[PDB]
RNA sequence: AUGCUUGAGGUUCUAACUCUGGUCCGUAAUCCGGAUCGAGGACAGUGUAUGGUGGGCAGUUUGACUGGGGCGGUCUCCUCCUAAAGAGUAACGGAGGAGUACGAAGGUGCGCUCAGACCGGUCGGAAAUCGGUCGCAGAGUAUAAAGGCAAAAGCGCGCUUGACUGCGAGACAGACACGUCGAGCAGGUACGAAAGUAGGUCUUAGUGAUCCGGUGGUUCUGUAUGGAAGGGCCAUCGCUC
RNA sequence: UUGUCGGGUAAGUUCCGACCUGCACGAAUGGCGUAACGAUGGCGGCGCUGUCUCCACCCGAGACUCAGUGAAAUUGAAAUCGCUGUGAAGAUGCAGUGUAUCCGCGGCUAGACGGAAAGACCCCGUGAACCUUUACUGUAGCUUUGCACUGGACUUUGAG
RNA sequence: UAAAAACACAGCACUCUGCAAACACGAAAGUGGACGUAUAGGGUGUGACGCCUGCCCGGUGCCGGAAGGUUAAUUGAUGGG
RNA sequence: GGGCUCAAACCACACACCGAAGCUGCGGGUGUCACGUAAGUGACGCGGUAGAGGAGCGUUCUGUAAGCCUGUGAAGGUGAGUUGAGAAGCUUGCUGGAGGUAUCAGAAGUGCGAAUGCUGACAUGAGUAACGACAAUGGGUGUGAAAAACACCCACGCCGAAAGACCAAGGGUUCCUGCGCAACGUUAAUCGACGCAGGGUUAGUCGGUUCCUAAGGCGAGGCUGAAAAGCGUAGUCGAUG
RNA sequence: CCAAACCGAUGCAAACUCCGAAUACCCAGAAGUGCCGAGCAUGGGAGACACACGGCGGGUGCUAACGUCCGUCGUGAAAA
RNA sequence: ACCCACUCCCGUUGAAAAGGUAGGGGAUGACUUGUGGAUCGGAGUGAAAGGCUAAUCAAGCUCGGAGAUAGCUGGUUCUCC
RNA sequence: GAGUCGGCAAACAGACUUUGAUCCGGAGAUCUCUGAAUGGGGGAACCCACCUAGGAUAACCUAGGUAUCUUGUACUGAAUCCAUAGGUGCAAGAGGCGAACCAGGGGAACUGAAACAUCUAAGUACCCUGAGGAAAAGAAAUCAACCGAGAUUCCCUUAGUAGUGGCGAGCGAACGGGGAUUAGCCCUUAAGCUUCAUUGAUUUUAGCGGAACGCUCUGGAAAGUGCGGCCAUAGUGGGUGAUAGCCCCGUACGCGAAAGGAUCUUUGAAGUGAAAUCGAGUAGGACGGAGCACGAGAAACUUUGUCUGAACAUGGGGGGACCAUCCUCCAAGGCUAAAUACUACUGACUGACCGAUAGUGAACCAGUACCGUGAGGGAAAGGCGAAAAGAACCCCGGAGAGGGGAGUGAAAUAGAACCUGAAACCGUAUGCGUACAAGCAGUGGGAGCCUACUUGUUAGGUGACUGCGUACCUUUUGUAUAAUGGGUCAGCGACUUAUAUUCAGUGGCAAGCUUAACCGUAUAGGGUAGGCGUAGCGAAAGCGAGUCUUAAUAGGGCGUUU
């Protein structure tokens, strides 16, 4: 049968021309103790690291 | 996704965004594709006849990608500033 | 209060219901059913909903390291040594700390320089405050150690909120996720006459991913449409996980 | 701890009697006694004896030989010695050396880490089973009340 | 591979049970208890007999009580959208 | 180890020689680069587990193939020779007696020594242990191919609350007679509960059946239960009586 | 009769340092040699994550162990 | 007699998947025994040993789910570079 | 249309048949006993009855009837007056079996989640019920989205998307589109369906005819060799003594039914659909469940165990909380073909399927033998030859077993345990070696001897003596290891397949490429719905060679020059 994409991976990794976007960790619930610089530089999307692409590419059924 | 029992990357990172249900009926037609339509009038049904958009597509937008070969009329189809200039440069026109 | 809707206890009544009570019949029959008498009686009992109880029974969990295992200890973070003069580097190797604190103990401008000793001096003594000489950091630096500290980074005072918002060239570090430093630009400030300084604290510990839920905003979305709900985005809260 | 004392023996870690310092007895998970009973545990004696000193002789049945029939476990292949070393650390097989003509039969079990059973002890596996409980989460059953089956009346009970 | 000191036992005691008994097997009907009826029946412990069986009710269980607190389904006042 | 002492020990120096799959020589193969638009030359390489990369052999089937080979001898089997770096190929003697398959492609149940692998055959142990109650045999005669075991006779020994005679259960022809001995019989067998054939079992009274019931079963209706069913009344079976 | 400080002589120290190499490491330039390449990037396929001994520097142990734990090199692993 | 199974020896590829010889216990009883019947798989039955339920028992056998799962052990077949 | 009395499996007997047998097909007759088993009983294949009618006089015989339940009907009929319950007769029907498919009731666990409880496995396995050749469903109180579609069922897509999920492992749509089929009828009573006539068509169950070849060589035998022909709407069929278009049976093609079955049809007849008359304990609601992809979630919708409970087209349902507006439909009554599922069974055809350890467990007297109390488990075992021509006769031997001749046959070492006839393993014969010699048994060197021709620079066999040398596999840091595995041989025995997908190689086409289902005198061609690509950025609205962040057109992220 056809391959089933991992639901959790698809909710965290958007495919754009240029890689897979994802948000950052450590921005959820303990933020007063974090500097503004740290919280501002942990904001936005980012491309997936080279070493994690094949693993995530397999979690999604794109390989 | 199995990392040996370590918290997997597909669970360390947060879920984000929502999918757009409103964007499931839309399509983008390049200016290089407008000349492949039949009958000199580019429309919703005429683009489906030319097999340039899917049958379910309900709203179309034209963006500047390629050269408009021939003058055509865009009837009920939106366009970008660059696409609109290119279409009218080739002799085309827009209708509501 | 004559009269009026209806809750909760009690006492009666019989007509539901119950009888593993008598009698008659089906019937050649201790089942059963019907009739009738008697006894209870809206109770009991059963369905459904609900609280309690419940190893009677079931499904399971009950960590790892480890000079075998168990017992004891340890598990994350910081400092020193091991560590072989770049970085890194193990042992149930040798030693200590952390799970905070501070709206001032932050910023700035201005000003100052400790510890200790000796001599003199009311209580006053080894040691309190005062004066003088030496002293030159042996003090201090919220806190463990190490590395720093004269433009003191130590101490005092005035004014303050830069413990700002968006960012960010470029690096260090690094399996990843995280982490560290940061010139400069814009906005808006504070202190200073000004050049300037300020994106916390001399530095290095003081910490916890995701999911889920909560709160404040939001030009996003809104299952016919307009709303709304719900969702997204930004900010933030809840783990001795 | 074979406690100490007494008895029993030539000599008694056992036994019997006692002491009390009961590591850590104790009163229906009964305490302490107790005639009778026991293929019950411990200890002593008489008798009796090949149990033993210490074995001898004898009688049957095997073993042994002949004729007939005819298994077994095991087995990588064998031209399958000792010793001292070496070596995955205890050697028929390696090194050095010694001894040693070839092949049976009766015997014996020192070795072939001899055969037999993928050690049962021990540890491990995010194995199993069954058992326990104030482990967790459930649950049969038992129990509480609401509603239904389920009604009449009279009386103590709030607001309209 | 264990015949025993284990189990049973007569006797003892505690407790439950008023009969459609408790209790047990059964989705239930029914059946056992028992064609019995507290001198009976079940469960529990002890274990002929003799002398006896002491103290503790704090814990847990069981029994009794119900003033107070807390407490389910249910009902739906009120407030906020 | 033998043995060794102006050493065959030790110290110093020197000149020889031995010694490897190292190096060189000679012949061959192969990898990668470069020159070659060629055959080939040049240089440097060529131990190897896990593992990656490359290039092949062979087997069965399909197409090529209504072809080709084949009774003047196919496949298979068993020897010999020969060719290639190898998997392997080719030629041929014998056996065999009717099928085989060139070449190039295409498909795979495609290659075995291990799995205490599975099935069959056959070894080793080994002509070894054993021949199943230590109640016991001896002789004569016969028959027979053959007699310790069969039959008969004369003796001996064993059981005799059985090792004798029965009834039941269970078995099922094993009973008797003729013929027979391959296998079966733990040896032989002429003998047999063995092989082939024939024969043999006679009931009013024995035992069943029939009559009657116990425990218990089933059970019309009936009561109960998701269904399947459970229970049970009237009945109807059910001996061990 | 003991003894602070100071003075002089005199030793020790992984967690002492007024000093302080060799090496090693980082960077730049340069010749030749690389077997035709060493370097880096991207991608396809892994295996491996039980190591052992020897030397050297160490901890630990008794400067015991064919011990144990690191660093570093060599060999075995996988090499006759 | 019958039922049983305390001791020794033998036997242990046994005559025997639990026996035999010699001794041993009960032997009118809570006895032994035949025939028929009832109770069984989280179930029965148990003078209680986790005993027994067809040489099988801390949950029988048989078929099915089923090729359960096996981070474990074993094995994995022609050639060359 | 000439043989026959079935097979193992023949031998003698006795017969039948051109007065048409055997054989094949249709229709009849008979059809013991058991089994739903049905008169009662029962340990299946057995025991015991009764009633009616007839016929025997003895101890019976023939024929029929005698189960239960449901439906209907008739007669009777309690407690209890009428009744009713009950009882008796009659008529019709049912029961049981069968591999799968269908609808429904009940419903696991292992497993996965690298533990495990929610979840998964899965509404699966299994148990049970009912029906039919199909079943079910089915004619919008349905979607959609302001445009419209127009019952049901099935296939391909949409799409592993939306969503769901200890947001873990997993589960997983719909809208829309392309197809296959096409059908709608009624409750003011129909389309249909069933049965019985009836009119014609086929079809099935036996059969008939069916072309055309000779010589020659080898050979046991010709179909093969060589030469020369003929048939073909028949040429790659099976046999026949080796390989056959022309030898036989067949094949293409053309005919054929007394009788039965079946399917289409044309009319007719009743029967049914049939619930009557438009849907009330219904819609809605509360609680607890189940299903919807949806696990309570903000949870619509369906369904119902408990409890309640409307309106009447000026009404009601839905459009995924909910409200308003709009759109769309009319529930609580029914019937309905086709496309779809399956094959225990029958026939034909086919296979880059097997070929006796394979293929069914079973090629053979196989669900047998055997094992088990039983449920159940469950084998092994094919080949003489063309033809039995299966060995007359003689000899040894026990009137044996087995052999030696003879004979048959092409061949007997094809002799019945029979094609071929491998290996392990066991022998006999010959050659060489071997009884002073230590070990993975070989390898390097090497004398002698023997054999054969090539007569010694040869081939083969053996191999004294001597250097070196501790099997293999596995597993390991490391194995001669005294670690593992193998007694040996022969046969079998382990990286497959499907569907999605990525990368590489090699092709087609190229800003395009490609179809799926499906259609298709069918590997063609059509079908371009869909998928991928030609544009990105952003969570998204959106903008777009840009976009996002931001006050910022500044910086920065990603993208754009193929
Ligand atoms: Mg947030
Ligand atoms: Mg299209
Ligand atoms: Mg009640
Ligand atoms: Mg438990
Ligand atoms: Mg489980
Ligand atoms: Mg551990
Ligand atoms: Mg360093
Ligand atoms: Mg260093
Ligand atoms: Mg003073
Ligand atoms: Mg002073
Ligand atoms: Mg400070
Ligand atoms: Mg809306
Ligand atoms: Mg919001
Ligand atoms: Mg004493
Ligand atoms: Mg004493
Ligand atoms: Mg006690
Ligand atoms: Mg007491
Ligand atoms: Mg006692
Ligand atoms: Mg006794
Ligand atoms: Mg002998
Ligand atoms: Mg030794
Ligand atoms: Mg011996
Ligand atoms: Mg052993
Ligand atoms: Mg083991
Ligand atoms: Mg015993
Ligand atoms: Mg007791
Ligand atoms: Mg030399
Ligand atoms: Mg050499
Ligand atoms: Mg060389
Ligand atoms: Mg050369
Ligand atoms: Mg080399
Ligand atoms: Mg190599
Ligand atoms: Mg072949
Ligand atoms: Mg083999
Ligand atoms: Mg192998
Ligand atoms: Mg022997
Ligand atoms: Mg012997
Ligand atoms: Mg013997
Ligand atoms: Mg005998
Ligand atoms: Mg003989
Ligand atoms: Mg007798
Ligand atoms: Mg006889
Ligand atoms: Mg014999
Ligand atoms: Mg006989
Ligand atoms: Mg019954
Ligand atoms: Mg009945
Ligand atoms: Mg009877
Ligand atoms: Mg009797
Ligand atoms: Mg350099
Ligand atoms: Mg590891
Ligand atoms: Mg490691
Ligand atoms: Mg190491
Ligand atoms: Mg070591
Ligand atoms: Mg080690
Ligand atoms: Mg290795
Ligand atoms: Mg006695
Ligand atoms: Mg026990
Ligand atoms: Mg047993
Ligand atoms: Mg179990
Ligand atoms: Mg399964
Ligand atoms: Mg398995
Ligand atoms: Mg009958
Ligand atoms: Mg019957
Ligand atoms: Mg009456
Ligand atoms: Mg039926
Ligand atoms: Mg799991
Ligand atoms: Mg039918
Ligand atoms: Mg139908
Ligand atoms: Mg409309
Ligand atoms: Mg013909
Ligand atoms: Mg032939
Ligand atoms: Mg209606
Ligand atoms: Mg409803
Ligand atoms: Mg509704
Ligand atoms: Mg809506
Ligand atoms: Mg309708
Ligand atoms: Mg077979
Ligand atoms: Mg064969
Ligand atoms: Mg002849
Ligand atoms: Mg043949
Ligand atoms: Mg043969
Ligand atoms: Mg000699
Ligand atoms: Mg020897
Ligand atoms: Mg040689
Ligand atoms: Mg040697
Ligand atoms: Mg080891
Ligand atoms: Mg070695
Ligand atoms: Mg070995
Ligand atoms: Mg050995
Ligand atoms: Mg072995």
Curated annotation (Swiss-Prot), chain A:
UniProt-listed Gene3D superfamilies: 4.10.410.60
Claim: Oxidoreductase is one of the keywords in the record: no
Keywords associated with the record: Ribonucleoprotein, Ribosomal protein
CC annotations in GO: cytosolic large ribosomal subunit
Compositionally biased spans, kind Basic and acidic residues: 52-63
GO biological process: translation
UniProt feature, compositional bias: Basic residues: 1-27
Annotated segments matching region Disordered: 1-63
UniProt-recorded Gene Ontology molecular function terms: structural constituent of ribosome
Pfam families: Ribosomal_L35p
Family the entry assigns: Belongs to the bacterial ribosomal protein bL35 family.
HAMAP family: Ribosomal_bL35 (MF_00514)
Name of this protein: Large ribosomal subunit protein bL35
Organism per entry: Pseudomonas aeruginosa (strain ATCC 15692 / DSM 22644 / CIP 104116 / JCM 14847 / LMG 12228 / 1C / PRS 101 / PAO1)
Gene: rpmI
From Swiss-Prot, chain B:
CC terms in the record's Gene Ontology section: cytosolic large ribosomal subunit
Transmembrane segments: none
Any one GO molecular function term: structural constituent of ribosome
Keywords on record: Ribonucleoprotein, Ribosomal protein, RNA-binding, rRNA-binding
GO BP, one annotated term: translation
Keyword match rRNA-binding: yes
Quaternary structure annotation from Swiss-Prot or TrEMBL: Part of the 50S ribosomal subunit.
Similarity remark: Belongs to the universal ribosomal protein uL15 family.
Role, per record: Binds to the 23S rRNA.
UniProt protein name: Large ribosomal subunit protein uL15
Organism ancestry: Bacteria, Pseudomonadati, Pseudomonadota, Gammaproteobacteria, Pseudomonadales
Record gene name: rplO
Complete-protein stretch covered: 49 to 144 of 144
């Amino acid at each position: 049968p056809k391959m089933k994409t991992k639901s959790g991976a698809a909710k965290r990794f958007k495919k754009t021309a240029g890689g897979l976007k994802h948000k950052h960790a450590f921005k959820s619930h303990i933020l007063t103790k974090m500097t503004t610089k740290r919280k501002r530089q942990l904001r936005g999307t980012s491309m997936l690291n080279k070493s994690d692409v094949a693993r995530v590419e397999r979690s999604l059924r794109l390989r | 996704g199995f990392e040996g029992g370590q918290q997997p990357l597909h669970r360390r990172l947060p879920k984000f965004g929502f999918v757009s249900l409103k964007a499931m009926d839309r399509a983008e037609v390049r200016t290089s594709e407008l000349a492949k339509v039949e009958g000199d009038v580019v429309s919703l049904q005429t683009l489906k006849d030319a097999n340039l958009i899917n049958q379910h597509v309900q709203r179309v937008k034209v963006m500047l990608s390629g050269e408009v070969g021939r003058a055509v009329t865009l009837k009920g189809i939106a366009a970008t500033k660059g696409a609109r200039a290119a279409i009218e440069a080739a002799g085309g026109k827009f209708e509501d």
